[PDB]
Scaffold this motif. Structure first.
Motif, PDB file in Angstrom:
ATOM      1  N   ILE A 183      12.680  11.808 -30.475  1.00 11.58           N
ATOM      2  CA  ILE A 183      11.443  11.152 -30.896  1.00 11.58           C
ATOM      3  C   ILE A 183      10.223  11.951 -30.459  1.00 11.58           C
ATOM      4  O   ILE A 183       9.189  11.941 -31.130  1.00 11.58           O
ATOM      5  N   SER A 184      10.350  12.641 -29.331  1.00 11.95           N
ATOM      6  CA  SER A 184       9.268  13.464 -28.810  1.00 11.95           C
ATOM      7  C   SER A 184       9.441  14.867 -29.369  1.00 11.95           C
ATOM      8  O   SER A 184       9.727  15.809 -28.631  1.00 11.95           O
ATOM      9  N   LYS A 185       9.277  14.982 -30.684  1.00 12.29           N
ATOM     10  CA  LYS A 185       9.413  16.245 -31.398  1.00 12.29           C
ATOM     11  C   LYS A 185       8.786  17.417 -30.652  1.00 12.29           C
ATOM     12  O   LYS A 185       7.641  17.789 -30.906  1.00 12.29           O
ATOM     13  N   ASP A 186       9.554  18.000 -29.737  1.00 16.61           N
ATOM     14  CA  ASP A 186       9.101  19.133 -28.938  1.00 16.61           C
ATOM     15  C   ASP A 186      10.151  20.238 -29.038  1.00 16.61           C
ATOM     16  O   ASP A 186      11.313  20.033 -28.686  1.00 16.61           O
ATOM     17  N   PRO A 187       9.753  21.430 -29.509  1.00 19.35           N
ATOM     18  CA  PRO A 187      10.673  22.564 -29.652  1.00 19.35           C
ATOM     19  C   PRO A 187      11.393  22.994 -28.374  1.00 19.35           C
ATOM     20  O   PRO A 187      12.485  23.559 -28.437  1.00 19.35           O
ATOM     21  N   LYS A 188      10.792  22.728 -27.219  1.00 21.04           N
ATOM     22  CA  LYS A 188      11.402  23.111 -25.949  1.00 21.04           C
ATOM     23  C   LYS A 188      12.673  22.311 -25.659  1.00 21.04           C
ATOM     24  O   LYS A 188      13.414  22.623 -24.726  1.00 21.04           O
ATOM     25  N   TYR A 189      12.913  21.279 -26.460  1.00 15.74           N
ATOM     26  CA  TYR A 189      14.096  20.433 -26.303  1.00 15.74           C
ATOM     27  C   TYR A 189      15.096  20.692 -27.427  1.00 15.74           C
ATOM     28  O   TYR A 189      16.136  20.043 -27.496  1.00 15.74           O
ATOM     29  N   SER A 190      14.778  21.639 -28.305  1.00 15.06           N
ATOM     30  CA  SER A 190      15.646  21.959 -29.434  1.00 15.06           C
ATOM     31  C   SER A 190      17.073  22.309 -29.027  1.00 15.06           C
ATOM     32  O   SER A 190      18.030  21.810 -29.617  1.00 15.06           O
ATOM     33  N   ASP A 191      17.214  23.171 -28.024  1.00 13.63           N
ATOM     34  CA  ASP A 191      18.534  23.578 -27.562  1.00 13.63           C
ATOM     35  C   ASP A 191      19.308  22.400 -26.988  1.00 13.63           C
ATOM     36  O   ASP A 191      20.494  22.231 -27.268  1.00 13.63           O
ATOM     37  N   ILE A 192      18.628  21.591 -26.182  1.00 14.33           N
ATOM     38  CA  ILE A 192      19.240  20.418 -25.568  1.00 14.33           C
ATOM     39  C   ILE A 192      19.748  19.443 -26.631  1.00 14.33           C
ATOM     40  O   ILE A 192      20.843  18.895 -26.509  1.00 14.33           O
ATOM     41  N   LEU A 193      18.957  19.229 -27.676  1.00 13.87           N
ATOM     42  CA  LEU A 193      19.363  18.318 -28.740  1.00 13.87           C
ATOM     43  C   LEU A 193      20.588  18.862 -29.474  1.00 13.87           C
ATOM     44  O   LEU A 193      21.488  18.106 -29.844  1.00 13.87           O
ATOM     45  N   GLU A 194      20.621  20.174 -29.679  1.00 17.75           N
ATOM     46  CA  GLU A 194      21.739  20.809 -30.366  1.00 17.75           C
ATOM     47  C   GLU A 194      23.025  20.603 -29.573  1.00 17.75           C
ATOM     48  O   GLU A 194      24.077  20.302 -30.138  1.00 17.75           O
ATOM     49  N   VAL A 195      22.935  20.765 -28.258  1.00 21.34           N
ATOM     50  CA  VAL A 195      24.095  20.586 -27.397  1.00 21.34           C
ATOM     51  C   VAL A 195      24.539  19.126 -27.395  1.00 21.34           C
ATOM     52  O   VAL A 195      25.731  18.833 -27.485  1.00 21.34           O
ATOM     53  N   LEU A 196      23.585  18.208 -27.292  1.00 20.94           N
ATOM     54  CA  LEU A 196      23.920  16.790 -27.303  1.00 20.94           C
ATOM     55  C   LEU A 196      24.634  16.446 -28.606  1.00 20.94           C
ATOM     56  O   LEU A 196      25.611  15.694 -28.612  1.00 20.94           O
ATOM     57  N   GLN A 197      24.142  17.006 -29.707  1.00 18.31           N
ATOM     58  CA  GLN A 197      24.736  16.763 -31.013  1.00 18.31           C
ATOM     59  C   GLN A 197      26.195  17.198 -31.010  1.00 18.31           C
ATOM     60  O   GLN A 197      27.077  16.443 -31.413  1.00 18.31           O
ATOM     61  N   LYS A 198      26.430  18.424 -30.549  1.00 20.21           N
ATOM     62  CA  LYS A 198      27.767  19.003 -30.480  1.00 20.21           C
ATOM     63  C   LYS A 198      28.709  18.153 -29.636  1.00 20.21           C
ATOM     64  O   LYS A 198      29.861  17.928 -30.010  1.00 20.21           O
ATOM     65  N   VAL A 199      28.219  17.686 -28.493  1.00 20.63           N
ATOM     66  CA  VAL A 199      29.026  16.861 -27.601  1.00 20.63           C
ATOM     67  C   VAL A 199      29.388  15.527 -28.254  1.00 20.63           C
ATOM     68  O   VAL A 199      30.529  15.069 -28.157  1.00 20.63           O
ATOM     69  N   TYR A 200      28.414  14.915 -28.923  1.00 23.54           N
ATOM     70  CA  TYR A 200      28.618  13.634 -29.597  1.00 23.54           C
ATOM     71  C   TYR A 200      29.768  13.725 -30.592  1.00 23.54           C
ATOM     72  O   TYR A 200      30.661  12.877 -30.600  1.00 23.54           O
ATOM     73  N   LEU A 201      29.733  14.749 -31.437  1.00 22.89           N
ATOM     74  CA  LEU A 201      30.782  14.945 -32.433  1.00 22.89           C
ATOM     75  C   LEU A 201      32.155  15.079 -31.771  1.00 22.89           C
ATOM     76  O   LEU A 201      33.141  14.513 -32.253  1.00 22.89           O
ATOM     77  N   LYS A 202      32.221  15.820 -30.667  1.00 27.61           N
ATOM     78  CA  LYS A 202      33.484  15.997 -29.954  1.00 27.61           C
ATOM     79  C   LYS A 202      34.000  14.681 -29.385  1.00 27.61           C
ATOM     80  O   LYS A 202      35.206  14.424 -29.398  1.00 27.61           O
ATOM     81  N   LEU A 203      33.088  13.850 -28.889  1.00 29.27           N
ATOM     82  CA  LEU A 203      33.457  12.562 -28.311  1.00 29.27           C
ATOM     83  C   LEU A 203      34.015  11.583 -29.343  1.00 29.27           C
ATOM     84  O   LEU A 203      34.584  10.557 -28.981  1.00 29.27           O
ATOM     85  N   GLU A 204      33.850  11.897 -30.625  1.00 32.36           N
ATOM     86  CA  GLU A 204      34.361  11.028 -31.683  1.00 32.36           C
ATOM     87  C   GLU A 204      35.779  11.433 -32.077  1.00 32.36           C
ATOM     88  O   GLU A 204      36.390  10.815 -32.952  1.00 32.36           O
TER      89      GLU A 204
END
Length: 93
Positions: free
Chosen positions: A15-36
């Motif tokens: 929600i806090s559209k900040d590019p400095k968190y782009s990498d973190i969001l990508e990793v969270l995304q990847k982890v989420y998919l694996k957890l499914e």
């Protein structure tokens, strides 16, 4: 629930559209998919704090609480491998 915490952490940060968190969001995304899961969760937490320090990022109090809860799920008695303490506790040394 791990998926829930990851999903919530992702959404809160996103929600806090900040590019400095782009990498973190990508990793969270990847982890989420694996957890499914404990090893994956711990690798994720290691990354979050390492990235935060290196990139000089400060999670909000609430985000810190979500990260804490995620590790607690990964470190629940007798579910996965043996852990030595709650994440970050000096009692493990």
């Amino acid at each position: 629930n791990a998926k829930q915490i990851v999903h919530e952490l992702y959404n809160d940060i996103s929600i806090s559209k900040d590019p400095k968190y782009s990498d973190i969001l990508e990793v969270l995304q990847k982890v989420y998919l694996k957890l499914e899961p404990s090893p994956l969760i711990n690798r994720l937490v290691n990354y979050l704090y390492f990235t935060a320090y290196t990139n000089k990022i400060r999670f909000t109090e609430y985000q810190e609480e979500l990260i804490r809860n995620l590790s607690e799920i990964g470190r629940t008695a007798g579910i996965n491998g043996l852990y030595r303490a709650d994440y970050g506790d000096k009692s493990q040394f």
